[PDB]
DNA sequence: ACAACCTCCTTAGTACATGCAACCATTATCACCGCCAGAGGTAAAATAGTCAACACGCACGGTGTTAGATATTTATCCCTTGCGGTGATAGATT
C-alpha cells in the first residue's frame, strides 16, 4: 500500500490506462475480435462434449451468448432436470482432469 | 578621406579507424490537511449459487490369471578369409 506510489510514480511502466483499459473505449473490434476467437474455440469443445452436459458449462459470466443467461431460456434447451444447469460449470475439474482437454483452447492470450 | 600596414590582442575551428568488455546510483523539498466526491463500505436481494446431504452411478486401477513374446540356448548354413596359381593386365606398339 506504500508501493501503490512506488510501482508507477518513479517514471511509469507501460500500464495502458492502468488496468481499466480492458473496459474503456478499446472494447470496440480493436480488442473484441480475440473474444470472438476464445468464444469460437470454447464453442467448438463445449459442443463436442456430452449431449446433456454441453449447455450449463457456458452460463453466469458472459461465455457464449450476447446475454449469457441464468435458468429460464437455457433450461428450456436442456430439459428433464434442474441446477445441474450450473454445477457442471465446475464438475469439469475432476473427470475433464485429463489436461489434454484444453489442447484447442489456450491460444487467446497470444492472438 | 581613406587605406592597409606594424605589432602582439583574443577569438575559436578542427583533432583518423575497426572491435570487445560492464554495472546502472545521487538529491530533498513541511504537501502540509482541509473538503467531499460519487465513492468506499456493507447490508439486504438481484444474477441466480454454493456444496453438503443422501442418494446416485461409474471409472479406474490393482490384484489375479492368462497369453505370447522374446532372449536365450542350440545348431545349422553361407560368406568370407587367406594363400596360391597363373592370370591379358598396363600400355607400347601395330
From Swiss-Prot:
Cellular localisation: Cytoplasm
Effect noted on mutating residue 51 to D? Disrupts the interaction with Escherichia phage lambda antitermination protein Q
Task: Outline the segment boundaries, as ranges, of region: Sigma-70 factor domain-4.
Answer: 45-98
Region (Interaction with anti-sigma factors), start-end ranges: 82-97
Q: What does this protein do?
A: Sigma factors are initiation factors that promote the attachment of RNA polymerase to specific initiation sites and are then released. This sigma factor is the primary sigma factor during exponential growth. Preferentially transcribes genes associated with fast growth, such as ribosomal operons, other protein-synthesis related genes, rRNA- and tRNA-encoding genes and prfB.
| Family indicated by similarity | Belongs to the sigma-70 factor family. RpoD/SigA subfamily.
Q: What binding partners and quaternary form does the record give?
A: Interacts transiently with the RNA polymerase catalytic core formed by RpoA, RpoB, RpoC and RpoZ (2 alpha, 1 beta, 1 beta' and 1 omega subunit) to form the RNA polymerase holoenzyme that can initiate transcription. Identified in a complex containing RpoD, the RNA polymerase subunits RpoA, RpoB and RpoZ, CRP and DNA. Interacts with Rsd; this prevents interaction with the RNA polymerase catalytic core and with promoter DNA, and as a consequence, promotes transcription from promoters that require alternative sigma factors. (Microbial infection) Interacts with Escherichia phage lambda antitermination protein Q.
The UniProt comment on domains reads: Contains 4 domains, connected by flexible linkers. In the active conformation, the domains are in an extended conformation, each making extensive interactions with the RNA polymerase catalytic core. In the autoinhibited state, sigma-70 factor domain-1 packs closely together with sigma-70 factor domains-2 and -4, contrary to the extended conformation that is seen when the protein is part of the RNA polymerase holoenzyme.
- What name goes with this protein? RNA polymerase sigma factor RpoD
- What gene, per UniProt, encodes this protein? rpoD
Entire-sequence positions represented here:
493 to 613 of 613
Amino acid at each position: 500500500k506504500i508501493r501503490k506510489v512506488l510501482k508507477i510514480s518513479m517514471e511509469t511502466p507501460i500500464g495502458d490506462d492502468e488496468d481499466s483499459h480492458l473496459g474503456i473505449d478499446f472494447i470496440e473490434d480493436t480488442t473484441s475480435a480475440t473474444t470472438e476467437s476464445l468464444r469460437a474455440a470454447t464453442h467448438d469443445v463445449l459442443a463436442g462434449l456430452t449431449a446433456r452436459e454441453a449447455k450449463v458449462l457456458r452460463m453466469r459470466f458472459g461465455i457464449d451468448m450476447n446475454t449469457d443467461y441464468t435458468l429460464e431460456e437455457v433450461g428450456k434447451q436442456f430439459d428433464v432436470t434442474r441446477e445441474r444447469i450450473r454445477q457442471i460449470e465446475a464438475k469439469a475439474l475432476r473427470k475433464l482432469r485429463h489436461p489434454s482437454r484444453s489442447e484447442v483452447l489456450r491460444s487467446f492470450l497470444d492472438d
